[PDB]
Design a protein around this motif. Structure first.
Motif, PDB file in Angstrom:
ATOM      1  N   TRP A 302      -2.695 -40.426  -5.131  1.00 16.47           N
ATOM      2  CA  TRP A 302      -1.866 -41.523  -4.620  1.00 16.47           C
ATOM      3  C   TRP A 302      -1.473 -41.325  -3.145  1.00 16.47           C
ATOM      4  O   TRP A 302      -1.074 -40.237  -2.745  1.00 16.47           O
ATOM      5  CB  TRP A 302      -0.574 -41.666  -5.472  1.00 16.47           C
ATOM      6  CG  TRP A 302      -0.701 -42.538  -6.660  1.00 16.47           C
ATOM      7  CD1 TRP A 302      -1.316 -42.245  -7.840  1.00 16.47           C
ATOM      8  CD2 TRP A 302      -0.185 -43.871  -6.794  1.00 16.47           C
ATOM      9  NE1 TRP A 302      -1.240 -43.335  -8.704  1.00 16.47           N
ATOM     10  CE2 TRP A 302      -0.548 -44.348  -8.075  1.00 16.47           C
ATOM     11  CE3 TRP A 302       0.538 -44.724  -5.943  1.00 16.47           C
ATOM     12  CZ2 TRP A 302      -0.225 -45.621  -8.525  1.00 16.47           C
ATOM     13  CZ3 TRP A 302       0.872 -46.003  -6.398  1.00 16.47           C
ATOM     14  CH2 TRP A 302       0.491 -46.431  -7.676  1.00 16.47           C
ATOM     15  N   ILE A 303      -1.607 -42.386  -2.350  1.00 14.17           N
ATOM     16  CA  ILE A 303      -0.990 -42.475  -1.017  1.00 14.17           C
ATOM     17  C   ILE A 303      -0.210 -43.812  -0.959  1.00 14.17           C
ATOM     18  O   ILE A 303      -0.820 -44.862  -1.074  1.00 14.17           O
ATOM     19  CB  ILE A 303      -2.026 -42.437   0.149  1.00 14.17           C
ATOM     20  CG1 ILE A 303      -2.807 -41.131   0.190  1.00 14.17           C
ATOM     21  CG2 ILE A 303      -1.307 -42.587   1.527  1.00 14.17           C
ATOM     22  CD1 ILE A 303      -4.026 -41.107  -0.699  1.00 14.17           C
ATOM     23  N   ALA A 304       1.118 -43.774  -0.787  1.00 10.10           N
ATOM     24  CA  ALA A 304       1.929 -44.987  -0.750  1.00 10.10           C
ATOM     25  C   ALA A 304       2.755 -44.998   0.518  1.00 10.10           C
ATOM     26  O   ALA A 304       3.379 -43.989   0.849  1.00 10.10           O
ATOM     27  CB  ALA A 304       2.837 -45.064  -1.985  1.00 10.10           C
ATOM     28  N   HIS A 305       2.755 -46.119   1.238  1.00  2.00           N
ATOM     29  CA  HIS A 305       3.571 -46.197   2.424  1.00  2.00           C
ATOM     30  C   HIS A 305       5.064 -45.965   2.072  1.00  2.00           C
ATOM     31  O   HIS A 305       5.647 -46.666   1.220  1.00  2.00           O
ATOM     32  CB  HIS A 305       3.414 -47.538   3.147  1.00  2.00           C
ATOM     33  CG  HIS A 305       4.399 -47.679   4.247  1.00  2.00           C
ATOM     34  ND1 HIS A 305       4.317 -46.921   5.403  1.00  2.00           N
ATOM     35  CD2 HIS A 305       5.556 -48.364   4.322  1.00  2.00           C
ATOM     36  CE1 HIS A 305       5.358 -47.188   6.167  1.00  2.00           C
ATOM     37  NE2 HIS A 305       6.131 -48.065   5.542  1.00  2.00           N
ATOM     38  N   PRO A 306       5.693 -44.972   2.714  1.00  7.07           N
ATOM     39  CA  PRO A 306       7.053 -44.633   2.295  1.00  7.07           C
ATOM     40  C   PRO A 306       8.103 -45.409   3.096  1.00  7.07           C
ATOM     41  O   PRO A 306       8.811 -44.797   3.910  1.00  7.07           O
ATOM     42  CB  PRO A 306       7.118 -43.141   2.577  1.00  7.07           C
ATOM     43  CG  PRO A 306       6.257 -42.978   3.796  1.00  7.07           C
ATOM     44  CD  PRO A 306       5.163 -44.000   3.689  1.00  7.07           C
ATOM     45  N   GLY A 307       8.203 -46.724   2.857  1.00  7.36           N
ATOM     46  CA  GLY A 307       9.099 -47.598   3.618  1.00  7.36           C
ATOM     47  C   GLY A 307      10.554 -47.168   3.464  1.00  7.36           C
ATOM     48  O   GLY A 307      11.368 -47.378   4.360  1.00  7.36           O
ATOM     49  N   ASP A 322       3.602 -39.339 -12.956  1.00 13.70           N
ATOM     50  CA  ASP A 322       4.094 -37.963 -12.973  1.00 13.70           C
ATOM     51  C   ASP A 322       4.745 -37.668 -11.606  1.00 13.70           C
ATOM     52  O   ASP A 322       4.267 -38.131 -10.565  1.00 13.70           O
ATOM     53  CB  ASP A 322       2.965 -36.972 -13.274  1.00 13.70           C
ATOM     54  CG  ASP A 322       2.349 -37.172 -14.658  1.00 13.70           C
ATOM     55  OD1 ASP A 322       3.088 -37.548 -15.609  1.00 13.70           O
ATOM     56  OD2 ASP A 322       1.115 -36.953 -14.790  1.00 13.70           O
ATOM     57  N   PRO A 323       5.845 -36.902 -11.605  1.00 20.96           N
ATOM     58  CA  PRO A 323       6.503 -36.648 -10.317  1.00 20.96           C
ATOM     59  C   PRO A 323       5.580 -36.025  -9.258  1.00 20.96           C
ATOM     60  O   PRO A 323       5.832 -36.243  -8.082  1.00 20.96           O
ATOM     61  CB  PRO A 323       7.664 -35.702 -10.692  1.00 20.96           C
ATOM     62  CG  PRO A 323       7.374 -35.220 -12.058  1.00 20.96           C
ATOM     63  CD  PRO A 323       6.541 -36.247 -12.730  1.00 20.96           C
ATOM     64  N   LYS A 324       4.522 -35.306  -9.622  1.00 22.90           N
ATOM     65  CA  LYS A 324       3.625 -34.793  -8.585  1.00 22.90           C
ATOM     66  C   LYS A 324       2.791 -35.865  -7.832  1.00 22.90           C
ATOM     67  O   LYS A 324       2.239 -35.558  -6.774  1.00 22.90           O
ATOM     68  CB  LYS A 324       2.649 -33.774  -9.170  1.00 22.90           C
ATOM     69  CG  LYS A 324       1.576 -34.362 -10.095  1.00 22.90           C
ATOM     70  CD  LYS A 324       0.456 -33.357 -10.356  1.00 22.90           C
ATOM     71  CE  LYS A 324      -0.306 -33.670 -11.643  1.00 22.90           C
ATOM     72  NZ  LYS A 324      -0.512 -35.132 -11.913  1.00 22.90           N
ATOM     73  N   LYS A 325       2.645 -37.068  -8.393  1.00 22.49           N
ATOM     74  CA  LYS A 325       1.739 -38.080  -7.803  1.00 22.49           C
ATOM     75  C   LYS A 325       2.089 -38.400  -6.346  1.00 22.49           C
ATOM     76  O   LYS A 325       1.220 -38.414  -5.453  1.00 22.49           O
ATOM     77  CB  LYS A 325       1.762 -39.363  -8.623  1.00 22.49           C
ATOM     78  CG  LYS A 325       1.296 -39.226 -10.091  1.00 22.49           C
ATOM     79  CD  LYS A 325       0.127 -38.286 -10.289  1.00 22.49           C
ATOM     80  CE  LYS A 325      -1.082 -38.790  -9.571  1.00 22.49           C
ATOM     81  NZ  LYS A 325      -2.276 -37.999  -9.853  1.00 22.49           N
ATOM     82  N   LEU A 326       3.380 -38.620  -6.118  1.00 23.12           N
ATOM     83  CA  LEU A 326       3.890 -39.050  -4.829  1.00 23.12           C
ATOM     84  C   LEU A 326       4.337 -37.858  -3.966  1.00 23.12           C
ATOM     85  O   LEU A 326       4.995 -38.037  -2.951  1.00 23.12           O
ATOM     86  CB  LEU A 326       5.055 -40.020  -5.035  1.00 23.12           C
ATOM     87  CG  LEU A 326       4.711 -41.420  -5.569  1.00 23.12           C
ATOM     88  CD1 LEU A 326       5.976 -42.259  -5.755  1.00 23.12           C
ATOM     89  CD2 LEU A 326       3.733 -42.154  -4.672  1.00 23.12           C
ATOM     90  N   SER A 327       3.969 -36.646  -4.367  1.00 29.47           N
ATOM     91  CA  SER A 327       4.486 -35.455  -3.694  1.00 29.47           C
ATOM     92  C   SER A 327       4.108 -35.410  -2.195  1.00 29.47           C
ATOM     93  O   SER A 327       4.952 -35.177  -1.353  1.00 29.47           O
ATOM     94  CB  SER A 327       3.978 -34.212  -4.403  1.00 29.47           C
ATOM     95  OG  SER A 327       4.517 -33.055  -3.824  1.00 29.47           O
ATOM     96  N   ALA A 328       2.840 -35.674  -1.871  1.00 25.69           N
ATOM     97  CA  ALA A 328       2.389 -35.637  -0.482  1.00 25.69           C
ATOM     98  C   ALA A 328       3.041 -36.732   0.353  1.00 25.69           C
ATOM     99  O   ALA A 328       3.395 -36.539   1.548  1.00 25.69           O
ATOM    100  CB  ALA A 328       0.868 -35.751  -0.414  1.00 25.69           C
ATOM    101  N   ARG A 352      -5.255 -33.682   2.030  1.00 28.85           N
ATOM    102  CA  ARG A 352      -6.515 -32.957   2.079  1.00 28.85           C
ATOM    103  C   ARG A 352      -6.226 -31.503   2.448  1.00 28.85           C
ATOM    104  O   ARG A 352      -6.887 -30.604   1.977  1.00 28.85           O
ATOM    105  CB  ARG A 352      -7.496 -33.599   3.076  1.00 28.85           C
ATOM    106  CG  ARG A 352      -7.102 -33.417   4.538  1.00 28.85           C
ATOM    107  CD  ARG A 352      -7.957 -34.261   5.449  1.00 28.85           C
ATOM    108  NE  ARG A 352      -7.591 -33.998   6.834  1.00 28.85           N
ATOM    109  CZ  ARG A 352      -8.447 -33.808   7.836  1.00 28.85           C
ATOM    110  NH1 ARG A 352      -9.754 -33.857   7.655  1.00 28.85           N
ATOM    111  NH2 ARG A 352      -7.973 -33.569   9.037  1.00 28.85           N
ATOM    112  N   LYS A 353      -5.217 -31.281   3.279  1.00 28.29           N
ATOM    113  CA  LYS A 353      -4.847 -29.925   3.647  1.00 28.29           C
ATOM    114  C   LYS A 353      -4.126 -29.186   2.514  1.00 28.29           C
ATOM    115  O   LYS A 353      -4.452 -28.032   2.215  1.00 28.29           O
ATOM    116  CB  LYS A 353      -3.976 -29.942   4.907  1.00 28.29           C
ATOM    117  CG  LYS A 353      -4.764 -30.201   6.185  1.00 28.29           C
ATOM    118  CD  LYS A 353      -3.830 -30.385   7.398  1.00 28.29           C
ATOM    119  CE  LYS A 353      -4.564 -30.235   8.729  1.00 28.29           C
ATOM    120  NZ  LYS A 353      -5.785 -31.065   8.794  1.00 28.29           N
ATOM    121  N   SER A 354      -3.144 -29.815   1.880  1.00 31.72           N
ATOM    122  CA  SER A 354      -2.483 -29.149   0.769  1.00 31.72           C
ATOM    123  C   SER A 354      -3.489 -28.811  -0.346  1.00 31.72           C
ATOM    124  O   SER A 354      -3.325 -27.824  -1.077  1.00 31.72           O
ATOM    125  CB  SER A 354      -1.370 -30.007   0.209  1.00 31.72           C
ATOM    126  OG  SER A 354      -0.791 -29.338  -0.873  1.00 31.72           O
TER     127      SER A 354
END
Lengths: 391, 392
Positions: A302-307, A322-328, A352-354
């Motif tokens: 997942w990548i979501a714009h964090p408005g 799952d709480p890990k989805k939005l971790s990055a 990609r780095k993590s």
């Protein structure tokens, strides 16, 4: 010449495979602003040090922002030189334009240089340029200044994207996909550069929603190289673009308006943006993923714009992610705040780095397919479907 | 696993087969037609500058040389009477100008799009993409969202909003449209360029004569196109195909056309010999586009050139030794409409196909098979589009 077999021309002219992200670089203004101490800093520099109650309102907003620091071009010294920008609503657009018309392509070039370094190809191989910003406008545009600053070929094909706001990080991928896939050998430099000098202003205890931006918006630029048909052993994809969409949410009229005026850029929110997004996002997921036989949204990276954090929280609850989805995503919001269009690309970079650091099997947290969303005025939602690459 | 079973097959199915084609062109202008012959009197009256007698005569010469007979303008006397700061040379007026153009730009754009959609004759639900281009005003959500709401297009149209590019952008929207259409099977692209001079209109200054030029030349107008590959036989009707595109920045042209959006509105800063720069460099651009098509005689092309002013047209003609008829359609649009910025080359495309049909030519491009469209603007930027006509 090519006129006697134009079908052959069309086929030679276009690329074969999917657009891929071949490199990502990021940059910020050097001045880091600590969120814990921002309320005090911001009310002092806006000569509002003595508005006690309103200061604590802003402190509360900052403490729930899920942001630890931001980078800002606007320093105390610059604001000393530009008192009209420290007022709530003074004529100040010229002052703001004088800053961002220079700083936006400057920061963008810094990100681009790092992306180009990673990519490792000569800058003469860049054929297209997409420049995206919501801070300031000028003719020729920031696309032109970047071309000059970088010393790209005069004949780069440029697409200048002004004043689109926070969904545009998705938009530049949607445009880059078509440019790269429809033109053999095409290598697209994509730059998103956002500077909050155009929105910064003093506090008003009779207009509290203007303070939300003062708590959330940070500065940053991200650059990508996008191209299809990567050269084996030389170029190195980290994501592939599979599919894109853009839509306007139902009953979202006026949810997020932005006006460029003589007082600079002002934002207004008339509806429940987190609620609107979370009520509708699953429709976009089905539209994007049924064709790929994917229905379990925790099997996507997942990548979501964090408005703001509320968008993330409500999307996560509504979809039972799952709480890990939005971790990055949450990590970039914490380290950089909301950098508008640049954000989702900072998040792609972080992921990609993590993923390489954690020993994951792919650039997408060990998963094969993922999703990138941009959210902004419309209310508009940009969907990008991504493939990861094996690590 | 669905389409995951074969993403190579997917990329081939997802893209179009053929070249992007123009399937329809619609145009629109504000109702108020402005005769060039009386415009010096009118302009110096409405800007309260009648006392500047020597400045007026300079302006009358600009108008007499402009090769323009008629323009259309959203700005009327009444509107200017309600907005005296717009009538001043340099008064805080951006907010008043924005209030106008943030509404008028999509309004005029909708009118043009409705005509284009009508000619195309297909349901508007089949429009998959929207490109909106303007150099007048900015807003969030953009004019593209406004157009979408006004037309009642699908909430899911893929939008490309192109703000503040200036006079080359009529070529730009084609270059973009070409990739959107060719790379997406079934895609049908609504392209709208819409330009309103209320953002740049201002009173005269005898110390800024070059700023007065734009007051002589700029007019309002909107043009809409439907672009798509793989036309449906006997149902859709192409008038041009898009073959090849380029964009370039001319050498030694730094600062030739700068436009700054300020509290006083849109203001320009001009340098260089623009007609010299273009005519000096344009054959290089022709050779880059046409050597692959084995075309070397520029009179065997049908021509669409952004009519920045008549000197640009005259010096390109002289430089390339074009037959004087080559730029006929270009000059006709300039004569009837003035320089409508990004919209202008699309009016000329319309004029090209319509005059060709009326004269009984064998193609939509004056009986010729291949043609060229050029946009000119800030940079100095040149947009080049290689065109195919369609047989009649």
């Amino acid at each position: 010449g090519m006129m006697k077999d134009l079908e052959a021309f069309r086929k030679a002219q276009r690329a074969d495979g999917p657009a891929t992200i071949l490199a990502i670089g990021t940059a910020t203004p050097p001045n880091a602003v600590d969120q814990s101490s921002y309320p005090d800093y911001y009310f002092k520099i806006t000569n509002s040090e003595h508005m006690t109650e309103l200061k604590e309102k802003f402190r509360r907003m900052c403490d729930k922002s899920a942001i630890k620091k931001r980078y800002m071009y606007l320093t105390e010294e610059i604001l000393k030189e530009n008192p009209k920008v420290c007022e709530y609503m003074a004529p100040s657009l010229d002052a703001r334009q004088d800053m961002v018309v220079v700083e936006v392509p400057r920061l963008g070039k810094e990100a681009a240089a790092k992306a180009i370094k990673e990519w490792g190809q000569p800058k003469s191989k860049i054929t297209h340029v997409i420049f995206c910003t919501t801070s300031g406008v000028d003719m020729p545009g920031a696309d032109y200044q970047l071309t000059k600053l970088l010393g790209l070929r005069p004949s780069v094909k440029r697409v200048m994207m002004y004043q689109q706001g926070c969904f545009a990080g998705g938009t530049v991928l949607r445009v880059a996909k078509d440019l790269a896939e429809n033109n053999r050998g095409a290598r697209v430099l994509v730059v998103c550069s956002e500077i909050t000098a155009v929105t910064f202003r003093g506090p008003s205890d009779t207009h509290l929603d203007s303070m939300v931006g003062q708590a959330l918006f940070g500065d940053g630029a991200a650059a990508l190289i996008v191209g299809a048909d990567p050269v084996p052993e030389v170029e190195k994809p980290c994501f592939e673009l599979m599919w894109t969409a853009q839509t306007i949410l139902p009953d979202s009229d006026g949810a997020i308006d932005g006006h460029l005026r003589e007082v600079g850029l002002t934002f207004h929110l008339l509806k429940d943006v987190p609620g609107l997004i979370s009520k509708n996002i699953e429709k976009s997921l089905v539209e994007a993923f049924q064709q790929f036989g994917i229905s379990d949204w925790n099997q996507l990276f997942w990548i979501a714009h964090p408005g703001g954090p509320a968008i993330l929280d409500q999307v996560e609850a509504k979809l039972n992610l799952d709480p890990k989805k939005l971790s990055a995503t949450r990590q970039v919001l914490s380290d950089y705040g909301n950098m508008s269009s640049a954000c989702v690309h900072f998040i792609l970079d972080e992921m990609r780095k993590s993923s390489k650091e954690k020993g994951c099997s792919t650039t997408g947290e060990g998963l094969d397919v993922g999703v990138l969303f941009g959210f902004g005025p419309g209310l508009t939602v940009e969907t990008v479907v991504l493939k990861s690459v094996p690590l």
